[PDB]
Amino acid sequence: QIVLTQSPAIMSASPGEKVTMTCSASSSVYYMYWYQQKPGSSPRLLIYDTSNLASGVPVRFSGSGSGTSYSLTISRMEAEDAATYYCQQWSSYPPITFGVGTKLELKRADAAPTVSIFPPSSEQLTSGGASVVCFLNNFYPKDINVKWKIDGSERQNGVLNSWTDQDSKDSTYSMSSTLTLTKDEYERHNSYTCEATHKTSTSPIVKSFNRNEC
Amino acid sequence: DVQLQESGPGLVKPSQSQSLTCTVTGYSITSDYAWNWIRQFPGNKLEWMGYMSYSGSTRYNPSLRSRISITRDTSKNQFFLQLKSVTTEDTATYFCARGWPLAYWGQGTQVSVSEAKTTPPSVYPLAPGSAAQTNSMVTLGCLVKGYFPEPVTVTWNSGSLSSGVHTFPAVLQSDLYTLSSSVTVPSSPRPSETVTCNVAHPASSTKVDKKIVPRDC
Numbered sequence: 001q002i003v004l005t006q007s008p009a010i011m012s013a014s015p016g017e018k019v020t021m022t023c024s025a026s027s028s029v030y031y032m033y034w035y036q037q038k039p040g041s042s043p044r045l046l047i048y049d050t051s052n053l054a055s056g057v058p059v060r061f062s063g064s065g066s067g068t069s070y071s072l073t074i075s076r077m078e079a080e081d082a083a084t085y086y087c088q089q090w091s092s093y094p095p096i097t098f099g100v101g102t103k104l105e106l107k108r109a110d111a112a113p114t115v116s117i118f119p120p121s122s123e124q125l126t127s128g129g130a131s132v133v134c135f136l137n138n139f140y141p142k143d144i145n146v147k148w149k150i151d152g153s154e155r156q157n158g159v160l161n162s163w164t165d166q167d168s169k170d171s172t173y174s175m176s177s178t179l180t181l182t183k184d185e186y187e188r189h190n191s192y193t194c195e196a197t198h199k200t201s202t203s204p205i206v207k208s209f210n211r212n213e214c
Numbered sequence: 215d216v217q218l219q220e221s222g223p224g225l226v227k228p229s230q231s232q233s234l235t236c237t238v239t240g241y242s243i244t245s246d247y248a249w250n251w252i253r254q255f256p257g258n259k260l261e262w263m264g265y266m267s268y269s270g271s272t273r274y275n276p277s278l279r280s281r282i283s284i285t286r287d288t289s290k291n292q293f294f295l296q297l298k299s300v301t302t303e304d305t306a307t308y309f310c311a312r313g314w315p316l317a318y319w320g321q322g323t324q325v326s327v328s329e330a331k332t333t334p335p336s337v338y339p340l341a342p343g344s345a346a347q348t349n350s351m352v353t354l355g356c357l358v359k360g361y362f363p364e365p366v367t368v369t370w371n372s373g374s375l376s377s378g379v380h381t382f383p384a385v386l387q388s389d390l391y392t393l394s395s396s397v398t399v400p401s402s403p404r405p406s407e408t409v410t411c412n413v414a415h416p417a418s419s420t421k422v423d424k425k426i427v428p429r430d431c
């Protein structure tokens with residue numbers, strides 16, 4: 001039953017800056033708890049009973065809240081605090097519920113995507129498949145488009161993109177675009193071009209391999 | 215320090231019943247506290263499932279109260295979650311945790327509910343197809359495709375090469391996953407200094423090393 005809605009949903013702050021995120025209960029709650037979670041790690045307790053700090057928790061963190069409206073504040077955001085923050089409630093057993101997290105990301109200078117394209121390995125072709133991979137690496141902001149052209153025309157079927165979350169050390173995003181084909185389809189075309197467009201340049205970065213190579 | 219470690223079967227067939235075991239270290243499950251089982255769905259959603267009070271009593275989430283059952287073994291300091299008739303929708307990662315307030319969580323175990331089958335990964339090298347002027351840096355990589363289930367673990371030059379690496383998040387190819395990793399080395403150490411990708415797949419007990427060599431000519 002009792003719903004927890006959080007604000008903001010994705011938040012980009014710079015190190016040294018002040019941070020405040022909100023968690024609203026749809027109905028009044030006895031206390032609120034706040035958790036921190038990094039990709040792969042389990043949830044860590046931060047603030048318990050609305051405003052109490054947990055044991056391993058730096059005093060840059062701080063919880064607030066009257067009935068139904070609560071908030072976790074990071075006074076000066078550190079780079080290590082880049083993570084997703086959940087609120088969770090205790091009221092009269094609905095049961096205990098959790099928000100869906102507010103995502104805290106780190107701010108940095110616009111970076112331009114290093115585009116690369118790879119033809120399928122001889123080994124891959126032997127199985128009857130042929131994938132064409134395009135690594136759009138190390139860019140900021142995360143907003144990109146990738147266009148695929150097999151022999152001049154624009155394709156949309158067979159493309160699979162995966163994105164990495166913000167890099168551990170330089171704070172940038174990277175994304176692999178893979179076009180999958182079958183050996184025979186692949187061998188009735190000659191230009192495979194991977195075309196990326198990102199905020200840091202109106203003209204796209206087009207990397208093109210052509211099936212007459214070496 | 216109190217210590218919570220869940221575990222149990224990683225792959226489960228629809229309509230069968232899963233059983234996870236949480237084993238706790240450093241504090242007895244009979245002297246104070248409520249012992250919880252909480253699960254985290256893909257994306258982010260945490261769900262409370264139920265708890266065992268130190269005295270024996272259980273409390274469960276009202277939606278899952280027909281389907282799940284929590285139990286214990288005080289001689290082995292263990293409490294268990296049993297999931298009856300599992301649907302696709304129970305695919306998630308299950309954490310046990312020390313109750314009220316929820317400090318002390320287990321590291322998390324993944325349960326995959328699928329009719330699919332433990333296939334090992336095919337790993338193919340990715341090397342430059344000539345292309346054009348770009349820079350003083352080589353990007354190469356590995357296409358780890360065709361496996362079930364998650365995870366595989368990709369490393370470059372046995373862990374020697376940790377900078378410049380980008381292992382991309384897996385995606386379901388055709389109800390088996392494809393995943394890929396990129397490493398960007400200086401053009402001077404290539405190919406004088408050998409780069410190689412080491413893939414590993416726990417479920418199928420597979421390790422495959424794969425040397426990236428300049429291609430074709």
Ligand SMILES: CC1(C)CC(Nc2cc(NCCN)c([N+](=O)[O-])cc2[N+](=O)[O-])CC(C)(C)N1[O-]
Pocket residue numbers: 031033049089090096314315316
């Ligand atoms: C133990 C502690 C410090 C944490 C409690 N937290 C708690 C306490 C309880 N039950 C208290 C029993 N009336 C439950 N519960 O039953 O789900 C949940 C929670 N929780 O989610 O944090 C809140 C109070 C102020 C009662 N206390 O005393």
